[PDB]
Write a protein that binds this DNA or RNA. Structure first.
Ligand SMILES: [Ca+2]
Ligand SMILES: [Ca+2]
Ligand code: NA
Ligand code: NA
Length: 276
DNA sequence: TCGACGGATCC
DNA sequence: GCTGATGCG
DNA sequence: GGATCCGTCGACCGCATCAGC
């Protein structure tokens, strides 16, 4: 069935007004996504911070439209070393972070340009593009190594500062998070080992699934739909893109949005409002 | 993801 | 320049 | 023993890149 994301709640439980708008988007080809007017959508959405995953673009090839973003002038990029046109993530912020780092401090997992870490006054932001386990699950084993090291790294981060984690985490946690769970138990993104890995992550850091925390009973809410078989217009999708929050930020949480109508990728953007 | 295809399985 | 592949999602 | 059900295959879209000429 179809899904309508409800209006933006821009007030916290405490009645405090949202001060921080973070948008996260798996763009699936930075250059293509801009040709399909993704930065126009971004300007209308006007986030303080924009996290992009799967840029598929080296730094020397960053398109010039990026220099047309006066509200997002601090930009940080990470691409793989060995593979061209693979992975890649970006983080663009209105204000300069205090510190910016790359990867998770484990060199087995820091080759593919998948993680940026941006520290602010009140919180640390991680945007992540999590390794897909691949058709035939040819990478599932590597991805369980990833989940383990990433979990550990995130736990250490949250132990010093409130943590926001956003991006394409390449798992539908529960049956409610995809349209066809029964048919997908052996496919990338809904294996038992990926679902446990995400459950372990929520329990160990610990972190809350912001969307879930606010809409526990809401099915049909997805962020990815295959380009094939007209899946998007049928809403045959998966919720793969999350904002995961340190529990201390839940009093600051105003809303966690799924921007179902924003085209340009086989993922849609998600948007977090916080009262900081 | 979805159809076609077989080969179980169920009133 | 153009076609059609491949790796990957 | 008619209908339904369940695993197994393949084609399927799009981006960026490369092979070949
Ligand atoms: Ca007979
Ligand atoms: Ca020739
Ligand atoms: Na790979
Ligand atoms: Na019969």
């Amino acid at each position: 069935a179809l899904y309508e994301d409800p209006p933006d709640q821009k007030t916290s439980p405490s009645g405090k007004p949202a001060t921080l708008k973070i948008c996260s988007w798996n763009v699936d080809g930075l250059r293509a996504w801009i040709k399909k007017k993704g930065l126009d959508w971004v300007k209308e959405e006007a986030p303080d911070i924009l996290c992009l995953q799967q840029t598929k673009c080296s730094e020397n090839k960053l398109p010039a439209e990026l220099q047309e973003l006066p509200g997002l002038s601090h930009q940080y990029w990470s691409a793989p070393s060995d593979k061209e046109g693979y992975s890649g993530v970006g983080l663009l912020s209105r204000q300069a972070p205090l510190k910016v780092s790359y990867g998770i401090g484990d060199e087995e997992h820091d080759q593919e340009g998948r993680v940026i870490v941006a520290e602010f006054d009140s919180f640390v932001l991680v945007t992540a593009y999590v390794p897909n386990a691949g058709r035939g699950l040819v990478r599932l084993e590597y991805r369980q190594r990833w989940d383990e090291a990433f979990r550990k790294f995130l736990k250490g981060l949250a132990s010093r500062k409130p943590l926001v984690l956003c991006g394409n985490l390449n798992v539908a946690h529960e049956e409610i998070d995809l349209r066809n769970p029964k048919g997908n138990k052996k496919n990338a993104g809904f294996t038992p080992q990926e679902r446990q890995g995400f459950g372990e992550l929520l329990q160990a850091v610990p972190l809350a699934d912001s969307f879930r925390h606010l809409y526990p009973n809401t099915p049909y809410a997805y962020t990815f739909w295959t380009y094939m078989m007209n899946a998007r217009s049928k809403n045959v999708g998966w919720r793969l893109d999350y904002f995961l929050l340190s529990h201390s930020l839940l009093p600051a949480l105003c809303d966690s949005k799924i921007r179902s109508k924003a085209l340009g990728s086989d993922h849609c953007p998600i948007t977090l409002y916080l009262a900081l």
